[PDB]
Design a protein around this ligand. Structure first.
Ligand SMILES: [Mg+2]
Ligand SMILES: [Mg+2]
Ligand SMILES: [Mg+2]
Ligand SMILES: [Mg+2]
Ligand SMILES: [Mg+2]
Ligand SMILES: [Mg+2]
Lengths: 184, 184, 178, 177
C-alpha cells in the first residue's frame, strides 16, 4: 500500500493475537482446575463465539464436550426481556451436566441473562459463563460471570469472530471499527 | 371387503367426528367471548395439534393469529423436567400478547408444564391452554387448563392428528388403537 | 359480511365438496402406496388438515417451514429452511399440498429440492391456482379451483398474519391496504 | 501421551503450517472476490476458525447444522437441515470448509444443494482426505493432508462427543472403541 494513500496507518488494535492467546491459556488452566471432577459442556452461540470457543477449548485440558446454538431477534421483545428465537437448539440434553457458556462479549444486552435462565430450566447441575470481552455497560445487568478475558472500553469492536455487517470475523485480533473521518 | 375375511367390522371409536365438531364449536364460542378485547395468538406444537388447531381456529370468531412450534425429545431429560429440543421456534414475538396453546392431549408428561413456563419467560400478557383431550393421569401434574374438550379414559388414542408410529393421523375421529389378537 | 373481505370467492361448502372429490381421486391414485403429505407452513394448514381427512388411505404427514433469502428467492425460488422434513422420503411417494400456485418460483425450487432426496415420486395438490401459474413450467396433478388474480385470504391464507381462520376464501378488500 | 489416543497423526505445528500455506493460496485465488466460508457443524469448527484467520481477504463465514435421514443419507447423501445458511449465496463465491472427506455421499449432496441456490461458484477446502474419497467423483480444490484409513480424533473431530479439543489429530485407541 503506497505511503501517499490517505488512510490510517494502523487500524486501531485493541487486543492483539498474542494477548488473546496468553489470556485464554490462563483461563483454560483455571477452568481445567475448577471442573477437574466433572468436565463441562462448552456451549457457544453462533457466530460470534466461533474463535473464542475453538481457542479456549484447546486450552482446557479436560474431556470437555462442545455444543452450539444459533439465535435470531424477536425485535422489540429481545430488547426488553432478552428473549431470542432459537434457530438451532442444543443438540445434547444438559440434565445433570456442568455447562459453560462461552461468550464473545458481554454488555448491557439482556440476551445472556435470558439464555442463562433458559439453560437453567433444563435441569443442568450448573451453568456458568466464560466471556472473552466485557464492556463497561455489562455492570447494568445482574449476572455472575465467572471467567472474563478482558475488560474493554465501550467501542464497536471487530475481529476474532466479531463482525461488522458480516465482515472482519477473520481478523486474528480484536480491533476498533473506525468511526471518524480520516484526514491525511 | 368380503364378509368371510377375518378382520374386525368396526374400529373402536372413542369420539366421533360430530362429537368433536360440536364440542369445538362450544369451545370456540367460549374462547371468542373471553378474548373479545384482545385476540390470542394460537400456538400449536406440531404434529399432533394440526387438526384441533385448524378446526378450533375456524370456530373462533375473532382476528386470531396462528403460530407453530416443532419439538423433539432430549431423552431422559424430557421425562424428568419436560424440557424439549426446539426444532422450530415461534416465528413471532409474543411480548404483551395473549397466547393460547392449543393441544391435542394432556397427560402425565411434563412437556406442557415446561412449555408453559418457557412461553411465560418471553413476556406475554397471558398464556392459557386449550386441549382437545385429557387423560386421568394429567391430574398428577399441577397445571391449570382453561379449555378442555373431553376427559377420556387412559387408552392409547389415535386419529384427529394423533398417530401411532406416524399412522392414523388423518382419521376424522378419535379411536382407540387395538392391540389384541382378532379372532373370527 | 366481513368488512376486510371484498367478497367471498369460495364458500365453506364449495371447499368441502371439492376436497371430498380430490380426496377420493387421490385415494384411488395412491391405493397401492400411500403418500407422505407434505405441507409448507403456514398457508397449507387448513387444506392439509381437511384434505388429509378426505383421503381414505394410511397417509403420513410432514411439514416444512421456510424464510426468504431475499433477491435469491425471487430469481430461483430458493428458500431458507427453518424446519426441514422430519422423515426420510427415500423411495416414498410424496404429495406436496399447497394453498396456492402462481408465478412465484418457490414451488418449482421445492419440487426440485425434494426430488433430490431420492423419493419414488413427488406430485402436487394445490387448493388454488391463479392465471399467472401458467408462466412456470410445472406439472400440478391435482387442482382445487382456478381463481382470478386477486389477493386471496382465509382458509389458512393470511394478510399480514390475519384472516387465516376464515372458513372460506375471500378476496382482500382494498380498504385494508388503501 | 493421551490414553485414548493410540498415536498422533498430525501435530499442532504441522496443521498450523499447512493452513498457513492453504490460506495464502486461497487468498491469491480469490483476490478479486472473497468467498463466503461455509462450515458444517460441529466437525468444521477448528479448521474453519483457524483457516479463516490465515486468509488475508474480507471473507464472510456462515454455518450449517445437519442430522441424518437414516438409510437415505447413506444412499444419496441427503441430510436433514437443522440450521440452514443464514445468508443468500446468489452470485457469491462459496468455499465449503470441511474436516474430512471420504466415501460418504454427504459432501457431494451438499455441493449439489448449494449449487442449486444460484452461487457464482462453490469450491471445497478439506483438512483431511482418506483413501476412500477417490470413490466419490468430486473435485476438491484445497486439501490439507492425505491420511490413512483410521478413525481420527481431535482438532474438532469427535468420538462420541469427546476429544474435539485436542490440538492435534490423533488415531483413536481401540481400547476406547
Ligand atoms: Mg499516511
Ligand atoms: Mg455472542
Ligand atoms: Mg401435543
Ligand atoms: Mg404455499
Ligand atoms: Mg404471504
Ligand atoms: Mg464434515
Amino acid at each position: 500500500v503506497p505511503q501517499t494513500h490517505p488512510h490510517p496507518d494502523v487500524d486501531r488494535v485493541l487486543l492483539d493475537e498474542q494477548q488473546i492467546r496468553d489470556r485464554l491459556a490462563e483461563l483454560g488452566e483455571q477452568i481445567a482446575a475448577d471442573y477437574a471432577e466433572e468436565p463441562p459442556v462448552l456451549v457457544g452461540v453462533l457466530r460470534g463465539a466461533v474463535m473464542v470457543m475453538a481457542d479456549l477449548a484447546r486450552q482446557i485440558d479436560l474431556k470437555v464436550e462442545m455444543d452450539w446454538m444459533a439465535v435470531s431477534s424477536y425485535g422489540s421483545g429481545t430488547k426488553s426481556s432478552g428473549v431470542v428465537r432459537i434457530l438451532k437448539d442444543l443438540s445434547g440434553d444438559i440434565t445433570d451436566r456442568n455447562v459453560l457458556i462461552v461468550e464473545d462479549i458481554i454488555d448491557s444486552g439482556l440476551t445472556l441473562k435470558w439464555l442463562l435462565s433458559n439453560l437453567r430450566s433444563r435441569g443442568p447441575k450448573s451453568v456458568e459463563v466464560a466471556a472473552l470481552l466485557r464492556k463497561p455497560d455489562a455492570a447494568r445487568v445482574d449476572i455472575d460471570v465467572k471467567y472474563i478475558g478482558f475488560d474493554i472500553p465501550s467501542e464497536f469492536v471487530i475481529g476474532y469472530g466479531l463482525d461488522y455487517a458480516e465482515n472482519y470475523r477473520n481478523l486474528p485480533y480484536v480491533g476498533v471499527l473506525s468511526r471518524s473521518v480520516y484526514e491525511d
